[PDB]
Amino acid sequence: PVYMVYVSQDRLTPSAKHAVAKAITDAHRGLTGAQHFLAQVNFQEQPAGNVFLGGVQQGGDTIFVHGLHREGRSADLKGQLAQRIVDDVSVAAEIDRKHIWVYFGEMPAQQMVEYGRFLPQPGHEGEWFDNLSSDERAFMETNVD
Amino acid sequence: PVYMVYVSQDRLTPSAKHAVAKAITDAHRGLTGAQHFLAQVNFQEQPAGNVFLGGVQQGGDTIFVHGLHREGRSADLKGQLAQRIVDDVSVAAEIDRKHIWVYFGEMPAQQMVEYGRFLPQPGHEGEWFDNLSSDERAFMETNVD
Amino acid sequence: PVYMVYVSQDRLTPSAKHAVAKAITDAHRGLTGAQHFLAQVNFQEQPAGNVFLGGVQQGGDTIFVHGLHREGRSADLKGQLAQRIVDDVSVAAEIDRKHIWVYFGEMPAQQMVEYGRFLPQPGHEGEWFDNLSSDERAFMETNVD
């Protein structure tokens, strides 16, 4: 999937970004079974003061995570996973839970392209990894930490 | 809700950001009943000329509001809220209305988290507030301009 | 439509940005039949090192298109246009297809404003584009490449 993660500039060091990215990627693999490299975490940094809560200007502890997913998963799972992104980012970034916003949007797999291919359904990933070129299979396996 | 606002760098001074974010927040709450703090306005600045229209590179006067809403509201209300945003940002950013694009996105409340918590149905908003931690009732209350 | 293009700062010259934007804008009108000025391509630049695939940080060679459409077009049609976007962006950004991710999102036209006006259904661009206003078409007609 794709996680847009809006944050203030300089709020996270490279280690913290790599820490927040990691906890999100491990939330997702861990509750869905998705092959790691399938997850993208994409930081959007903007200057602090660009974020307003109830018309009040905020400092730089706001975190907004927008996960773009595939249709097909239960409402009980999306909650856990959202809840787990809340907890594990709160630790990884050392910011209070109450500073964290998480929305999930969903689309059908057939209008969702990753690594230049169309995606499988959620219960079809095994077929997905057993019908790609190895130039492809090699690339994605470089994208796992 | 979360309103991502895409503007060209400095088209809105820090006050002008406050006015717009105050314009979006006051259309929402006024038209839905959503408590004041519930609304985030998120400014995403980019250098001028990163925006294209029909292929024609543009200047620093485009605005695109992308609204992320809970499912469960009528189309009437949503188009009503879309117009008032166009109207009230025009006035608050002194941008001509033909520059303002507004989209609304909906997701089930059950996969949306604000202040580390899952949202209610729009028909549950007030009770949801009551049974929050008092850390949470208060941290929220501090974000109402 | 609004295409959010997520690219790293400096991966694209002003000529290359116009190349990608022309690639997206053309595919979309070619396949939907929608009038030129209706398509916006919004570049969103961030320093390299902000994108993570499988927890591994990336250089400036990742591109993410998040496309936002009216509801009403077929799955085969949506799939064809994402594929065309992959092919044509890759060429116009001299980038390799494995580095391109494409997500389409859809919403009710009745909650979609462009140029400060509401949108017709995916086939109503005639009647709509012709009873606009005095200048609404006019200001929208300059935006053709």
Q: Quick check: C64 and A2 CB within 8 A? A: yes
Assign 3-state DSSP to chain C and report helix, strand, coil percentages, each to 5: 40, 30, 30
Q: In what order do the strands lie in the sheet with B40-46?
A: A56-57, A51-53, B40-46, B2-8, B63-70, B100-107, C112-114, C117-118
CB C8 within 8 A of CB C48: yes
Q: How was this model experimentally determined?
A: X-ray
φ and ψ at residue C57, rounded to 5 degrees: -70, 145
Q: What is the DSSP letter of B129?
A: H
Domain of C40 in residue numbering reads as: 2-141
Q: How many domains does chain C have?
A: 1
Minimal Cβ distance to A114: which of C6, C101, C104: C101
CB C88 within 8 A of CB C24: yes
Q: How far apart are CA A3 and CA A83, in angstroms?
A: 15
H/E run at residue C40: strand C40-46
Q: Quick check: B111 and A78 CB within 8 A? A: yes
Q: Quick check: C113 and B82 CB within 8 A? A: yes
Neighbouring chains to B with at least 3 Cβ pairs closer than 8 Å: A, C
C85 Cβ contact list (under 8 Å, min separation 6): C23, C24, C27, C28, C65, C67, C100, C102
Annotated ligand binding at A114? The verdict is: yes
A76 Cβ contact list (under 8 Å, min separation 6): none
User: Among all residues of chain B, which has the CA nearest to that of C116?
Assistant: B98
Q: What is the DSSP letter of B127?
A: H
Minimal Cβ distance to C108: which of B47, B75, B97: B75
In whole angstroms, how far apart are CA C13 and each of A105, C20, C94? 32, 10, 12
User: Among all residues of chain C, which has the CA nearest to that of B71?
Assistant: C107
Q: How far is A101 from chain B (nearest CA, A)?
A: 5
Residue A56's CATH number: 3.30.429.10
Amino acid at B47: P
Neighbouring chains to A with at least 3 Cβ pairs closer than 8 Å: B, C
Tokens matching residue B132: 């929050």
Q: Where are the alpha helices (DSSP H) in C2-124?
A: 14-32, 75-92
